[PDB]
Amino acid sequence: DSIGSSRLEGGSGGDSEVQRTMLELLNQLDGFEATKNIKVIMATNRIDILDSALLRPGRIDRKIEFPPPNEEARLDILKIHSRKMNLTRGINLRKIAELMPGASGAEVKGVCTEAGMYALRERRVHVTQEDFEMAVAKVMQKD
Amino acid sequence: PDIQKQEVREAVELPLTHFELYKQIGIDPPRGVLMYGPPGCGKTMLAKAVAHHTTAAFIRVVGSEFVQKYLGEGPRMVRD
């Protein structure tokens, strides 16, 4: 799963090497099976989904829609992210989870990972709602 | 062995000379500065601009010197 940096000229072929690798791997799996419980799960944030659709013109695939920041899906994973880092009991996650729709769920993780740094810089042992709010503002400054 | 230079300024010289202010406003200073586009070059003009605006240690890159026959030198170099 790649958003960061590529040449897209020679890098497209560089990725095409890995695509060829998983291609021949799928050719081995389709060819025969030595043992069960063998699967592969990939991810793509870009047009390389359609490129994979070009490499796999409707042969073997499993399609699952993945909307960014769906909601109820934001809450539980926000709790999961709140398990590792220190968080008080007087904070409301609902509205701060509902404060960033229509964009993505990565903004939430950004808000969290930053809130850790915010709490460390403000010398706080815990994270508050105002921290999450300001973090939301900061991550919405870019978008 | 007007908005661009202001945003960059606030993303460079303001975090440099101001700490406790950022602690008061509760805002973490941005580390990165991003550029884009084929016509836009940058990478020089802005660096020299910051160099003239603020006086400090600046590190300019000659490209990648860490790619060699020895792969163990790189991590130690960037660590140094």
Place this chain on the structure above:
Amino acid sequence: NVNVKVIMATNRADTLDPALLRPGRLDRKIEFPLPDRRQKRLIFSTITSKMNLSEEVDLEDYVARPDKISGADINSICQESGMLAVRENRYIVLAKDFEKAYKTV
């Protein structure tokens, strides 16, 4: 708990890998495909601040025409104009050297 500054440079925004652009790292993202009037005015202002300016030099045509046709390394072109002005033909650099440096490269 440390003092450092790291800035990034990239040509395109579709640049693709799992390293640099991961959310939570870069707090500033600026797309700059086609430089506007204000940015040109400022970037010419900072370069006309140190170097000797002139009243005959117009910033209007240079804030206009490059908006249509945009080249790279503006400061380098200005330095080339400095190489045109190092010929000791004229004391104060004018729009002639700039336009010449623009049409040549």
Place this chain on the structure above:
Amino acid sequence: PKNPDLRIAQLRFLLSLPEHRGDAAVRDELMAAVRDNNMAPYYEALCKSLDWQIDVDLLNKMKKANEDELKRLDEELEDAEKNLGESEIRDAMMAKAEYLCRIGDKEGALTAFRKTYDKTVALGHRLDIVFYLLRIGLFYMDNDLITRNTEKAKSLIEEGGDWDRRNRLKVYQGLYCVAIRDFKQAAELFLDTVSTFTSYELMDYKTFVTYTVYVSMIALERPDLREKVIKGAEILEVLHSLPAVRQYLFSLYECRYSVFFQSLAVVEQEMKKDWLFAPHYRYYVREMRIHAYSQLLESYRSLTLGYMAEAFGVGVEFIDQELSRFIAAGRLHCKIDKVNEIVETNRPDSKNWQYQETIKKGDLLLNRVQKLSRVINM
């Protein structure tokens, strides 16, 4: 506490001994007696106060007010107790302990601050509690007790210096170094005066400057002054507060004892009648005198009695016994001879003496290797 009642109760020193200032002192003591539950402190200080005629009147109201407020704090504590929360019980116990500092009960404050010490989620809040012990520690003027929690909280910080936290702590260090006679090691403490602001919790800014001006002017020599205060703009900004300080600095820097001895009375009167600065009023005078004498005798070898008497504007008979005492007891320079009726020194403290500076540590090392030889075989 952080209330002005701390300073009001800190004025008890000048309220007690002198009978001259015992009017306004007991006046604003009685005036502030109705604030921040001052009943118990002035009840204990009642021996230095007036009769029981007007005293027992307010006691009946203050004692029931104290009980009501305390049982209300207990009620709030019970409301916070048996419930889910962290900062609630912390702030409740903290405020309760603050009121326990207001009444002046050290035991209740001790056990309360101990409980909230055990309830500390972080080292920062712990340091806040420590400071809460320090502010009342200034009133109780304890020594080892206030240094105990600070020495304990000294290690394992890792969060770095904050804005008003490290600053206030630095101020506390300045204060406990005002109490102790340590100077040279305390010379780094007042360098934070740039970031210091007005504080109503312990001491005012101008009062802090007024307190540190003594150690800065006396304990620090001219190179130290030029390196710190003269180069700095702080004293340049705060000299406009009072005309006295500027004159005291200029007269000493220009080595003029004429106006210095004239204004010396004001310095002496300002030196005494102070809470923590009282026992040291004997030391600073002698130290400043011997420092001035050493400074004047530094660049001067043979001194006539006339120019000296004109410079100091004082009799020769007094500086006679003065210097005579500063020979043996003072131990500053070499022997002075009056045979020529003119002061003439020698002071071979440079060449051979620089090499003779190690003979003391050498003899001590000799005794110490005699100790090392004493450990041998048994």
Place this chain on the structure above:
Amino acid sequence: LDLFLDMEAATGQEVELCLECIEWAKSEKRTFLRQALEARLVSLYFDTKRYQEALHLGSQLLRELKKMDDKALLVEVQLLESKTYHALSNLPKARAALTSARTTANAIYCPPKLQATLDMQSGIIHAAEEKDWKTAYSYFYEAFEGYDSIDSPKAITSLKYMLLCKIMLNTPEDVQALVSGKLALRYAGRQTEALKCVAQASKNRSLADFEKALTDYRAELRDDPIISTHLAKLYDNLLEQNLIRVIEPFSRVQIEHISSLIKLSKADVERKLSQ
């Protein structure tokens, strides 16, 4: 208000009248008016040599000024802030306020009155620490260009500042070259004569004559600014030159004999020496 303050009469009721003006402006709810009245008021306290309420109300003014529009108005009060901090002699805050004023006034074109005052003050700031006399001389030069022929006192004090900062580096030749000019000849007066005496005492390397310049002309030098400390610094500098000149070859010699040439008392001499 300005025309009333230019008269300089009964300054006691002036401040109270200004307070009435501020109260009235607040009564009619005019922000810019009361801000201007306070901007003049802090100048009044600046002329009253009171650095407390001027800096306090000045700061309180800055707080509401930074939040609002018209950044050009901030340049004035920040300049006066640099002035009063120069009176309090504080380098970092005055330099920071100066830089802030520069980056504030960079976009907006300032009048020659305010613009030249920036460089004029900056020159004194750089002359305080005595880092580089050239840059300072440049600042006083541009300040002279801005203060040129607007008013007589401003011009004569401009050339006064020029001759001062240029005599800080002790070159009387350029002083003569400047006073030989016809342009500065019409701006000449009793002010530049003392400077000519200083330049003469510098080129002749005379002490007692410089003391005479500090004697007869002190009636004037009475209104002399804080630069008098720098003047005494130059005096003590030349004094140091003489002291390391005539004393050095003599290992041990009579003090009255070596002071016979300088024909001055040995008191201040012994004081400075021992110092």
Place this chain on the structure above:
Amino acid sequence: MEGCVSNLMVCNLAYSGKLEELKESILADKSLATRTDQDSRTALHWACSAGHTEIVEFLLQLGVPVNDKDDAGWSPLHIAASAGRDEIVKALLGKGAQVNAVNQNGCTPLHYAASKNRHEIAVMLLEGGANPDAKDHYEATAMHRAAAKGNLKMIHILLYYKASTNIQDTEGNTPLHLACDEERVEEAKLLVSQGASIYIENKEEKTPLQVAKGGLGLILKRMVEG
């Protein structure tokens, strides 16, 4: 470094602002004012640049042509507008100088008048019968630069003459787009309330609503429908 801005003596004298030596030069030789430098300019241009009224009034009294241009086509009126001097403009317009004169980029003096933010100069220039709807080689009016430098009063006095806001740049960017790019709320709301069409699309096919950020285009559309 600094020095003479031109090789000619009369030009440097006009730039230095010496009245007596210049008058003496003219009285000595009348052909000195007709001379041309390497910059193809005369003493009149440097005199208008210096901001001296007496000199330019004397020259205009002598009857020197105001239509004289350099290699870059700069007119004395452009220099006068760029200098920010009212009296010079009064003199030039008083002598009947052409306001339709164009420079290398074809920018009218109104552009430089709005660039230096001079209200009086702009008003006096537009009073002489000048056309606010005139376009340069880049096909842009003074309203563009006025909205770019964030001048409300300039656009206001430009609208006092009922100048059309429907002028389209060759790039496709209307003054409203520049008003949104400058993030000026007052200017945007004003221009929109004046009947400016928001349906004009550029070469990038970007509506003015998408140009502004922070929901400014929303309240702009609110002002349109309202």
